[model samples]
Target: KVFGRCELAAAMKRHGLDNYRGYSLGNWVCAAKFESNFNTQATNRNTDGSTDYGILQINSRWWCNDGRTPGSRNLCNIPCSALLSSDITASVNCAKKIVSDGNGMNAWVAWRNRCKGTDVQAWIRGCRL
Candidate 1:
C-alpha cells in the first residue's frame, strides 16, 4: 500500500506524470484517489465481464489480460498482475500510453464521473510535489 497522498504525489511526479502529455498532476491525483484511493492492489469487476486494475483502474478488456477475458488487446503488453504493485512503473507507463491515445483521464470512468470539469488542484494540496 502507498504511504499517503504526499508520497503518491511525489511518486507520480518522479514518474514524470506531474504534467506530462498535457495532463495535469492534480488530474492524475484526482484519478488515483477516486479510482483506488492510492491503493495499489485495488481491483473491481464490472458486470460486463470486465475488471479494473490498480490505482488507475485500467480495464482488463482493453489494457491488460487477466486470463478470464477472452479477447483482450493487452495494449500495455504487461500482465494484469503487474498493475497491482506498490511500484507503479508499469502502471504509469501504461497510463502514459493510454493518455497519448487521445483519451487522457477520460479513459477512466471515475475520472469522468468525479474529476471531469472539476478543480482538481485540491487533490495535490499540502502535498510535497
Candidate 2:
C-alpha cells in the first residue's frame, strides 16, 4: 500500500517509533516518504551487490538475509522478502532493532539527506496519537 503521510505517521507511532532513539515519529514518517514513498513493496539494488527492501529500504548486506548478499549480517534474522508485505510489522520491527543498535536514523541516507537536522513537525502535522 502506498501510505499517505498521516496514515504513515499513525502507523509508525503505533509501532512504538514516536520517540525512537532521538528521532521522532515525524522523522520516521518523513524517512519513509523519501525511502520508498510509503510503498511496502519497494526495493532498491545497490551497486555494492546489496539490495534494499521495504519502506525503510533496509539493505540486505547488514539487516536481512535475501540469499543474495554474500556477506549478509542478517541482524534482523528475517528473510528480506518479509519486508515487502502490506503488513509492515517485520519491516518496522527490523527498523526498530536496526535503530536500537546505535545506527539511529543514520541507517538510511534518505533520512539523513532529507529528514535529519530539520523540523519535521509538518511531516506528521495532521496526525495524532
Q: Please provide, for model 1 over 1-129, each residue's C-alpha lDDT reduced to its tens digit, 9 standing for 90 to 100.
A: 854887888899999997788778989888999999889999999888889999998889999878998766799999999999889998999999998888767788888899989998888889765
Among residues 3 or more apart in sequence or in different chains, the pairs in candidate 1 whose N, CA or C atoms overlap within 3 Å are none
* Candidate 1, RMSD to the unseen true structure: 1.2
**Model 2's lDDT to the true fold?**
0.88
lDDT of 2 by residue, 15-67 (tens): 88888777888899889999999999899999999999999998899889999
Candidate 2, residue 13: lDDT: 85
TM-score of 1: 0.94
Q: Please give each candidate's TM-score.
A: 0.94, 0.94
**RMSD to native for every prediction?**
1.2, 1.1
lDDT, model 1, position 83: 95
Best candidate, TM-score: 2
